[PDB]
Design a binder for this molecule. Structure first.
Ligand SMILES: O=C1C=CC(S(=O)(=O)O)=CC1(O)O
Ligand SMILES: O=C1C=CC(S(=O)(=O)O)=CC1(O)O
Ligand SMILES: [Ca+2]
Ligand SMILES: [Cl-]
Ligand SMILES: [Cl-]
Ligand SMILES: [Fe+2]
Ligand SMILES: [Fe+2]
Ligand SMILES: [Fe+2]
Ligand SMILES: [Fe+2]
Lengths: 359, 359, 359, 359
C-alpha cells in the first residue's frame, strides 16, 4: 500500500554506514575502539568516525554526541552521483520529507540526501566519499576479534509486508523470511550487495533500529569478542549468542553498547547475487530458525531496540504492532516451538527451549 | 572422613575409558558413530568398543546393551602391571568390595581390578590393553567434528570435601574449585595427567555420573558438532552450550545420548603438571565461573545425571546432598549471581542471567 | 586493438561452471568426489556433474571423458534470458565463431551460447539452469575440507593489456595487477560479482587454462585438504602453498588433478563491488606479491597450464608470449626480487627466496 | 658411550625457560614483545624476562645483552627442591662441570644448578621460581598470534645415538626418530611432560642450539604470525613453513630473531604420557617426514644453528658430525626422497621437492 513511484529507484550498492547518537562520547569510544577494535578515521570532542579493517570509504560508523541516544541516519551508497538525484525524485514522489546537502551531513561524505522514509526511518543516499587507507593487509593492526566489514542494518517496524513491498520497489531482493500458517509475517531479510542482506525488517513497535552488524573473517574471531568481554568483566553486555543462525546460516553474536545500541557480529552467510536466488521461508514455531542449535532467543532481543530521529533531530513517533508477536507465539505463556514439525518430543509449550521461562 | 591407607596408592596415569550400559545398541551406535564420528575397535550384537582419533589403547568407550542405562565402570590406566595389585591392596584396606579379572572385564583389556569405591562409584584400574592403529594422522578419516582424545569424567557426589580428600590421597591434585563465603564447596576438579582434570566432583545427590568428556583440536570442531545436530534435527539433544568455561578455561558443549547419558566436548584448557600449580577458587555466585560469557546454566545440568552400577550390575542407591544446592543459590527463586563483585549492576536476583527464569 | 562493439555487452553475473575434459573418468571421480568432497548432481559413464556446498544451480564442474585433457568451456551466468541474445550479438560483432544451443551443451543448462573468444578461449554464456537442493546447511554432509563455492577462473594469455581491454569492455572491472617500472604487465585480476575476481589473466604462452578456484569457509579447511593429501600419500599433487596471497589477500593452495588440471582452494578475499573500488598495482619484483610470506613460487606454476578446446573439440594452438617472463625476471638466472624496495638485505638475485634455486 | 650414573636422575618436569644472549636488547625486545607479543615479567637495561600467555612461573625466556649471541642456558624445572641436589650429584658422577647458586643465576629463579653437560650444552635445573599472574584468561591482552606455552628445545649434536642414550638415562622417553636403512640416526625426539618432546636431537656439528619452540592454541594463530611479518615487511625472517610436521604431527613455523636465533611456533601434537607410548621411526628419504605436505626443507634449516656458551660465558667449540648428513642424503646433489616408498613417481633425485634445487 506504499505506491510504486513512476520515478526510477536509485541504484543502491550496499549499506555503507550508520550515524548513532551517543550520550557519553568517551564511554562510547572505549566500547567501539578499545573493546571492539574499530579504526579511527577522524575524531574530535563531538564525533568519532570509525571504519572496519577492509573498508576504503571514509567510515562505517559515526558516533555523534547528543542528548538522546538514537539512530540519526542509516546510509546506503549508490552507484553514481546521478543516483543521488534519482533518490531525491523517488522519495519526493512518495511524499516523504527530504534534505539535500551538497557538502554532506558528516565528514568524509560529499553530496548526500537524507529522507524520512515511508516507515519513518532516516535513510541517507550518497555516492561521493573520501577514500582512506584500506587496512585489509595491515596485519600489524589486526586484533584477535577484528571486525572486517559492515554487513547490514536491521529495522523494527509494525507491518512487515508493507515495508517489504516498499523495499522491493526500491530494489532490495528478499532472501529469507519468517511466517506462520495463518499468514502473519514476523521478519524479512533483503539485499543489494549479494549477501543475505543489507537491511532487514523485524516485526515490532517502530520505527526503531534493531541493530547494526559487522563481519569477521572467522568464527573464532567472534568467540574472542565474547572471551574479551568476559576478561573485561562486561559479560552482562553480551545479550544473545554466540550461535549459528537458521535464517542466513551466519555465525553470530549480539552485544550492547553503553547507550544500549545493539551491535551484531556476523560471519559466513551465503551468496545471493543471482536474480532467481531461492527464497527461504521458515515457520515461526521452528525452534531452529533463529538459533540453529535451538538455544532460546532472549526476550530483550524481541522487545528492545533504539529510537530513531527525524530530520530535525527529534525522536520519531513509535507505532504499536498489531500483528502477532514473535515472542508471544513462541516463548510466551501461550506460545510454542518445535524441533521437528509435528513431534511433541523436543517441543516447548509456554516457555523457551533448554529449560527456561521468561524472567 | 575416608581414612588414608598405609598401603601405597596405585600410580594413576589418566582416565582411559568408560563402560556405559545402553538400552538400544543400534540407536546408541547411531549417536556415537554416525553423529559423533567415534572409531569402532570392535562390535557385536551386545557391545560396541569405540576410540578417539589419537588413541592407541583398545578403546575409550564401551557401549554395553542392558536393561537399565547406567555407568558400569570408569576406568583409569595405571603406570605398571604392579599398580593393579597396589590398587587391590589399597581398596581392600579401605574396606571396599573389589573384583579382579586376570583377563579383563571387557575386550582389549588385560588384568583389571574393579572396585565399589568409598563414594559408591565403579572404578576400574588396569595396565594391560591391546594396542590398535593410532589414527592421529589418518586425515582421510578426519571428521569436521573429530573427537581426538578422552579428557575426563565428572562425578555427582553429595559431600565434595569428603570425596576431595579421598581423591587427593589417591594422588589426584586439585586444580580448581567452586566455594562460597560460608564454607560450602560446590565442585572440585582434579588431575593426574597434567590437564585441568581427569575426574571432577559436582555437588549433588549421588553416586551419579555427570558426564564423560572428549576433546577436539579446535573450537570450530565443537561448532561443527552443534551445526551437524541442527542438520539432523536433533538440536533438542544439545543440552548446554557451546561456551567458554570459567573454571578450566576450555571451550565446551554438552549433548545427551539416546539414554540421556551426558557427553561433554571440550578443548584448550591449560597445563597443570607442576606440583605447585596454582589452585583457583571461584565464588559460587560469580556468573562467569561456569560460562565465562555469563550465559545461564541450564537447570537440567544441575539436576540430571546417570545412574551408576555396583559390581553385581544393580543400580547404586542415591544418597541426598544436604549441603546448599548450586542451582538454588544461583538461579533458584532465592538465588543470586553477579557479573562484577560488589556491583548491583549486572547482578541477578531470583533468576538466571540473560532474562530467563527456571522453567 | 580488440575493438569495442556497438552492441551492448551481456550483463554477466559471475563465473558459474567449468567443463573439463578428463582421460580416466573413474580416476577423476576419485579426486573430485573422494578426495575433495564435491557433490554429485548427475553422473553416467561419460560425465560427472559436481557442485559446491552452497550452490543452487545444477553444477559448478562437469568432468567429460575425452581423448585429450583440456578445458572444454568456462561458463558465466548472465542476468536474464535476453543477455544470451546480447552475448551472441556482441561476439558476432567481434568476428568470433559462436554456437547457440536452445537446450544447452551439458545437462542442467538451458539456452546457451558458446564462443571461441578473441583470446582463443571457449567461453559459455547462459541464464537457464536446473535448480537443485542448496546444501548450505547440510552439516551432516559437511567435510573438514568442504569446498563451498566456485570462485574464479585463471587464464594464461600472451598479451595481458590486450586481453584486459577486451574484458573491461565486456564489463569486468580490474581490481589488482602486476607490472614493472618498464611498463610490462604480467597479470591482471577482474570481477563481476564483487569479489577480487571472476577471471584473471596470467602472462604466458596461450590460450591455456591456469586453474579453476573453489572457496572454503575458513583457513583450517584448506589446511585439512593438505593434511588429507598427506594421509593419502599424494602430497606430490600439492603444487604450491598453502599460503597467503599478496594480490587478493586470500589464503590459498594449488593442487593437481589426475590430468594435471590445476585447482586452487581459496578463502577470505575482500569486497570489490563499489564502482570506484581502488585498483592495486604490485611491482613484479616484490617478493610478497604472490606469496605474502615470501615463499618461493614453484617454477611449474609459471610454466604449466591446461590446453583449451575450440568449438569442434580440437586443441587450440599456443601463441608464445614475447613480453618479459615473470619467472625469468624474478627467479631465473638474471632475475631478482626484494622484501623491502631498495634494500639488498632480503633481496634475491638469480634464485628464488628461502635458499632455493630452480630445479 | 656415556655411562649411566649410580646416582638417581633428577625428576624433570618439563622444559621451563631459555636464557639467550642477544647483541642489541632494544631490537630483540621489538621482535619478542612487539612482533611476537610475549609478556614482560621484568626488564631493565641488561635483560628482558618474558613469559607466555598461560605461564605461572616467572619466565619462559630471558634475553641477556652480551657481546656474542648464543644460548646461555636451557632450563628444566624439577619436581622438588631435593631434585636440584640429585642433579648436582648426577652430573658430578658424570664428571661434568657444575655450578650451584642458592639464589639463582637469573631473576625469579631460586636455588639452581647449571652444568656443562656431556654433549657440551648449558643445562640448568631448578625448582624454586617466583610465581606471577597466570594470564591464561586475560583475553583483553590476547594477540591474534598469541604464544601460550613454552613447548621444547631442539639441540644440534654430532652423534644422535650417543646423546639419545644419555637423555634416556636422564629420564626422557623417545617418542619419534628418523633413521635410514643403513643404521644411521639423523634425529630423535624425547619427552618428560607428556607431549611429543621437551627436547630433541638434530644430527649436525655441535653443540649448537637449533631452536626454542612456543605453542599457540590454534593453527590460525600461526598463520597470523606469518601475516603480521608480511605486514611489517620482515617476511625474510620467516625461514621455513608454515606447515604440518610428519614427526610430531604438529602445525609449525620457523622464524629468525635479530641475532638469527631460530624460534619455532608449534601447535597440536599428541599425548605421549603412557609409558608404553608407541615409538615412531621415519625413514630419512620419506619426503613427508618433516613437512607432511612434502614441501622442501630449507637448506639453512640443516646448516644454521646458534652458538652455546660454557659456564665462563665462552662459546663451546664445535665438533663435526661424521655420520651422514640429512641435507646431503635428501636434497643434496646425490640426495633422494620419495612420496610413496618404492614408487619412482613422486620421487626426487639430486634436488628438493616441488621443483627446487639447493641455492
Ligand atoms: O543477521 C541476522 C540473520 C539471521 C537472524 S535470525 O536470529 O536467525 O533470524 C538474525 C539477524 O536478523 O540479526
Ligand atoms: O587467486 C589468485 C589470487 C592471487 C594470486 S597471486 O599468486 O597472489 O598473484 C594468484 C591467483 O592468481 O591464483
Ligand atoms: Ca554467602
Ligand atoms: Cl561448567
Ligand atoms: Cl621438521
Ligand atoms: Fe542481523
Ligand atoms: Fe566436564
Ligand atoms: Fe586464483
Ligand atoms: Fe621443534
Amino acid at each position: 500500500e506504499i505506491p510504486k513511484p513512476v520515478a526510477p529507484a536509485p541504484d543502491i550498492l550496499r549499506c555503507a554506514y550508520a550515524e548513532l547518537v551517543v550520550t557519553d562520547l568517551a564511554k562510547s569510544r572505549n566500547f567501539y575502539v578499545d573493546v571492539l577494535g574499530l579504526h579511527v578515521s577522524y575524531e574530535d570532542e563531538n564525533q568519532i568516525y570509525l571504519r572496519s579493517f577492509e573498508e576504503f570509504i571514509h567510515h562505517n560508523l559515526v558516533l555523534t554526541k547528543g542528548p538522546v541516544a538514537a539512530l540519526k541516519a542509516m546510509a546506503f551508497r549508490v552507484r553514481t552521483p546521478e543516483d543521488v538525484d534519482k533518490a531525491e525524485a523517488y522519495y519526493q514522489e512518495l511524499g516523504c520529507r527530504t534534505e539535500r546537502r551538497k557538502d554532506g551531513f558528516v565528514k568524509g561524505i560529499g553530496d548526500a540526501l537524507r529522507v524520512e522514509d515511508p516507515l519513518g526511518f532516516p535513510y541517507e543516499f550518497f555516492f561521493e566519499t573520501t577514500h582512506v587507507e584500506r587496512l585489509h593487509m595491515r596485519y600489524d593492526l589486526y586484533s584477535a576479534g577484528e571486525l572486517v566489514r559492515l554487513d547490514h542494518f536491521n529495522q523494527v517496524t509494525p507491518d512487515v509486508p508493507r515495508g517489504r513491498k516498499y523495499l522491493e520497489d526500491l530494489g532490495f531482493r528478499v532472501t529469507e523470511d519468517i511466517q506462520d500458517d495463518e499468514g502473519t509475517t514476523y521478519a524479512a531479510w533483503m539485499h543489494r550487495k549479494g549477501t543475505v542482506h543489507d537491511t532487514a525488517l523485524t516485526g515490532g513497535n517502530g520505527p526503531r533500529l534493531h541493530h547494526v552488524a559487522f563481519s569477521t573473517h572467522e568464527k573464532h574471531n567472534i568467540i574472542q569478542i565474547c572471551d574479551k568481554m568476559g576478561a573485561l568483566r562486561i559479560s552482562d553486555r553480551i545479550e544473545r549468542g554466540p550461535g549459528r543462525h537458521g535464517v542466513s546460516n551466519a555465525f553470530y553474536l549480539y552485544i550492547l553498547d553503553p547507550d544500549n545500541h545493539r551491535i551484531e557480529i556476523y560471519t559466513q552467510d551465503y551468496y545471493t547475487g543471482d536474480p532467481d536466488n531461492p527464497t527461504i521461508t521458515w515457520n515461526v514455531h521452528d525452534n531452529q530458525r533463529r538459533d540453529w542449535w535451538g538455544n532460546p532467543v532472549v526476550p530483550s532481543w524481541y522487545t528492545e531496540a533504539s529510537k530513531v530521529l527525524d530530520l530535525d533531530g527529534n525522536v520519531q513517533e513509535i507505532i504499536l504492532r498489531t500483528d502477532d508477536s514473535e515472542l508471544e507465539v513462541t516463548i510466551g505463556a501461550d506460545g510454542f516451538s518445535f524441533t521437528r514439525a509435528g513431534d511433541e518430543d523436543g517441543s516447548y509449550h509456554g516457555q523457551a527451549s533448554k529449560g527456561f521461562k521468561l524472567g
